[PDB]
Design an enzyme around this catalytic site. Structure first.
Site, PDB file in Angstrom:
ATOM      1  N   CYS B 180     -10.644   0.841   3.329  1.00 12.08           N
ATOM      2  CA  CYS B 180      -9.443   0.599   3.810  1.00 12.08           C
ATOM      3  C   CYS B 180      -8.215   1.247   3.178  1.00 12.08           C
ATOM      4  O   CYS B 180      -7.033   1.197   3.462  1.00 12.08           O
ATOM      5  CB  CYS B 180      -9.106  -1.101   3.860  1.00 12.08           C
ATOM      6  SG  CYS B 180      -7.832  -1.523   5.293  1.00 12.08           S
ATOM      7  N   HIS B 316       1.648  -3.918   1.452  1.00  7.50           N
ATOM      8  CA  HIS B 316       0.683  -3.977   2.458  1.00  7.50           C
ATOM      9  C   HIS B 316       1.025  -4.419   3.587  1.00  7.50           C
ATOM     10  O   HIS B 316       1.071  -3.791   4.558  1.00  7.50           O
ATOM     11  CB  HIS B 316      -0.538  -4.458   1.884  1.00  7.50           C
ATOM     12  CG  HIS B 316      -2.111  -4.164   2.372  1.00  7.50           C
ATOM     13  ND1 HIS B 316      -2.284  -2.942   2.946  1.00  7.50           N
ATOM     14  CD2 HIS B 316      -3.109  -4.966   2.788  1.00  7.50           C
ATOM     15  CE1 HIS B 316      -3.502  -3.005   3.469  1.00  7.50           C
ATOM     16  NE2 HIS B 316      -4.108  -4.236   3.170  1.00  7.50           N
ATOM     17  N   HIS B 354      -1.839  -1.197  12.428  1.00 10.47           N
ATOM     18  CA  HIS B 354      -2.838  -0.964  11.008  1.00 10.47           C
ATOM     19  C   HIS B 354      -3.843   0.145  11.438  1.00 10.47           C
ATOM     20  O   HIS B 354      -4.813  -0.028  12.011  1.00 10.47           O
ATOM     21  CB  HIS B 354      -3.448  -2.190  10.583  1.00 10.47           C
ATOM     22  CG  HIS B 354      -4.267  -2.098   9.341  1.00 10.47           C
ATOM     23  ND1 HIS B 354      -5.342  -1.462   9.025  1.00 10.47           N
ATOM     24  CD2 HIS B 354      -4.037  -2.975   8.150  1.00 10.47           C
ATOM     25  CE1 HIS B 354      -5.555  -1.499   7.763  1.00 10.47           C
ATOM     26  NE2 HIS B 354      -4.901  -2.552   7.256  1.00 10.47           N
TER      27      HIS B 354
END
Lengths: 61, 747, 747
Positions: B180, B316, B354
């Site tokens: 990720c 984030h 995302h």
């Protein structure tokens, strides 16, 4: 509560807040509890880290 | 200018390119950030039933229909890179997108098709999802040679070797994956192996494309998938996150070299820390708290920036109800200050959703653009804060409207972050670059010209249709310069002229030329015509005064003119001395042959044949500079030179008669040739195209217009030679017009 | 020592572990190298039918039946690593082996369970085939949560994150892939990351498992595979390549740290280069030549080694008919030296076959062992050299019998190569380490003691069956010291006594022990006895001498007669006085407090109550010394010092009755207990196990035999405060026994 401990002892298998508390464990407990005579919510699913507080919410509902 | 203290370890960023949902270039990416717009889309039933969805799932209440999707994943320009049709057919769509995105992110940096003397080298890293794996092994086979071709081409981890083979790159190349945060791990080891002195131009990357485009997901109640279709970070209404698609590549070079060569710098990366979380977390699939505050303090300390100057922290921000007070708590504890409400926040995962393994480099390109354009953009879908946060006794405030960068924070600094799902944590303090003064004075100076090029006419029409927003946003002079110097050239050409107000007038081509006839210049007679060989305008060229200082270092030595030296003020007494007039010619022709590489003949019609032999290589400079000053007295006998051998090319003619080893050994022709013929078209026809300036010329831009017309005619031009002493600043111009085929999705 | 200069760039290899074919540990791998036998197996016509090969392929003549298989793909230790049973069921066999091999690497380096102070990275590559992909794609994943579990756990992307989480390691993690030199690119990233100062250890190495473990491979004509079954490198009958299986992990640490901490070092890496071939070849699958020659010259420059003192070149040596003249011509052009034959050659790819992701680390482990043992090993299949190999004019010669390291090439230097398929080409100059020499002369030294330990009796019995092959090869003193200090301890214990010449014999059990009791010590009255609680055997401890120096310094400030203030001379005149006996007893009690950390209840009867008090901490030291002095000459007007609460651990007593806050302040009690005499042997009945030596002591090793008989019972005794001032070198020892379940493969 007895059946909840029975499935967590089936999944993890230790005879004696230290459960799974992860991806499949919470949902697997939450699936049959709504089918059970108890009533559980997703909010108290993500708020309760122990079967004692779950059983306290059982007595509340 | 940088304006801070240079330690040993800094890394520049000299050009990025993206392809994100509803964002096909950089200019649309900044236009989508500044307005706070969202880039998710919503489908309906009719465009879903055409894609092959069973009707027994749409009626299920678990199929929320939205997905941030790339436009155009199935097209590729196969013959340009080196492939053929079946080899371009068998490629995984990751590689078809990443070839074009990496070539744009080279060409935006300036170094396009010029990396055969720099040790460049790729570091990309790519994810995987299983549907193309299911679609690739449904073919039949018997483990043949074609099967071995499908075994290495269709792999998802011979990506970076294909890119560095197809663009001829000869340095380190890896294909990492830390979950990720792939792009920030690859950018971190690109900074380390750039600082060791191994490669010169490193490229980060990361790409994920989930193959059944135009389709929703399956929400779940005990998970992190948002049950709304919407992703909202740090909000009281928040539900989950949103997994989409992406691309993206930067280009990284050291600071000292990219300030020597004069490039376009967006940011300067300073420090970078990585650490796993370890077994302090509860299981495997969730990040903790101590790892986050440790990586923030390590990357602030390792780059010598105290944490009370950071005015922007890209978080984030996945948008869960659990991760967000954790991340705000870590970002409060690591900033050990007591100042109140001075730093902004944000999360791009509101704007695009995302992205799965390009998330870090999406963060990096957004923070690089923020330090370059100097605004602070809004956070998208923010109404009231999360109830477990306290913004009062903590440094962070969440912006809602676009603001200029506040003073008493200069120079700007900002810090990116991307924590994975599994543990690997990265953080990287950036410091912006302080822009120049733009001293063009807003005067009424000149039109300037732009030389487009593309290898066919339809691509040329696309590329000239590109030009209107690029002229609308950028500046015109720096656009013209960085289209002149730092882009390649191709076959079919066109010039577009830009005036002072913004108009676009196409430039008219020549009329009478013949293809096999070579080029050449004409020199006049210095006795009657005091005008030089076009040296009235070439004074401001920097190459010309270097040749002037080269000639005046030999003229002043032994000739001893009557107090006329140092090459200063030839524009006042140009008509008197034959010596300065011959010097003039020599320098003017010298510039006019370094300006155009396809110039061969250097003929003349009287009193210029000796400078023509001087600067064509037939005679050395010493004897002709000896003879030119003694030509002023013109009393005693003539001198026959040593007759050196000239360079290949550069043969000399006199009246359109180029001959070799016929009249270069006798003396009668050399005595005959010193007469004034007084005939510009004295050769009749001899199939020689001549460098003749237009008759109606006053200003210096007309000669540059002529140089542009000879660029359009089909001969390469040394443009940098014309410009004066401040060379104008390089910049960002124009993408390439690829020619799309169509290639079907397998299955 | 090391015996060269030291720049900044050294990296030391301090432990390796392997699981190559027919090579299930490390000593078997070295025996298989130095004999020259090959590890490939052949099958019959029925063992293939027994495991899922139909008869319709057996009769095909283009089917060679051989594959270098690992044994023990399936099995695992379930509950050791922190797993359940279902989680252990759902893994992927690359992970199920590389857990075990990386733990053997840490157990061999010495830091088995002592990674609590260092910052340990991981950098592990891998390689993914297609057969487990077709085995796992078509199986029923389940719902979204079980699909999440199977995609997170069961893939080759979360491998290094699993190794860093199951063990407790919190440095950087990555997971590379550069397609045939995956291991050596991971090792090179580990060198570049150690040298900056992020991590303080590393790991490396890849893995490759192809799931039907016993099955043939299709030979053919276009693609290269061996048409016979054997991989001959550089041979007139060379046929092809043989694809096999493997594993392997090393452990790297800087040189200054790994000499100033005492560890064991095999070989130290001096330099490393990576490039890419580029487009400087013909095809994507063909090998280049300029890339190989450039990377060899760059890694012989960056490590400051001239290529004259390189004694052994480990090459790729693929064994096809084209790659071998190219590789040999590249090497003999990089070693531009114009000597004749001096440097050997080799390839491990005839011993085991091509490994496909761990071939680089097979090269690194073989070259490390060859520099450590100093024996050139023979080439595995070699009768006559290739036809177009120019051998006699080139620097290299190829051995066919194992010979010692030629004594004019010192210190030994080697060199490892591994060139990929179109990817990175890695080379890496190693350098050996000059040995440490024993000071014995084949004499009758002493028994040693080996402390084995394992968590149940079956694993203990399998562990104690390892001492015959370890003792037949190693030496028997460093084995005992490494087993004493740098390995963990567990529940069920056993110690083994090894005499001068073999004859292993288990030490006897210790009887008459009552459990759940405190351990105590007693020192009798000093007016009669001379054994100052066994301070004659402890005089060589080099911890006894530190307390003797401290008490020498403390009595130097005040004591009146000389020759009692000299250390190392107490034992000469101890029998004449009492002050020396008290001074000996203080240090003997502190050393027996070091030895045996869980000794608690001190005691003392008569005059020994004062040194027991001073060792416990209740009174003083200087007051105790001069108080003993007026008890030496005067014994009138005792001046009782005021007591403390000594230490939060220890409890003092008088005869066996612990005075736990009993009186503590009565002058009559101390005077009655102390002033007359004691003269009992005492200690009738109480419940504490005294530390009493057996009465047949007659050497110095016999107290070590008694303390090992204590460690056979429950006392966690330190194993390092007994040895004298040159402590023995550390070295290598036994490796853990894993409890094996069985997990079947889902076909």
């Amino acid at each position: 509560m007895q059946y909840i401990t029975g499935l967590m002892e089936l999944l993890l298998e230790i005879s004696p807040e230290l459960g799974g508390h992860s991806l499949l464990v919470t949902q697997l407990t939450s699936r049959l509890e709504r089918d059970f005579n108890v009533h559980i919510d997703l909010l108290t699913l993500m708020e309760n880290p122990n079967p004692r507080n779950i059983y306290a919410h059982i007595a509340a509902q």
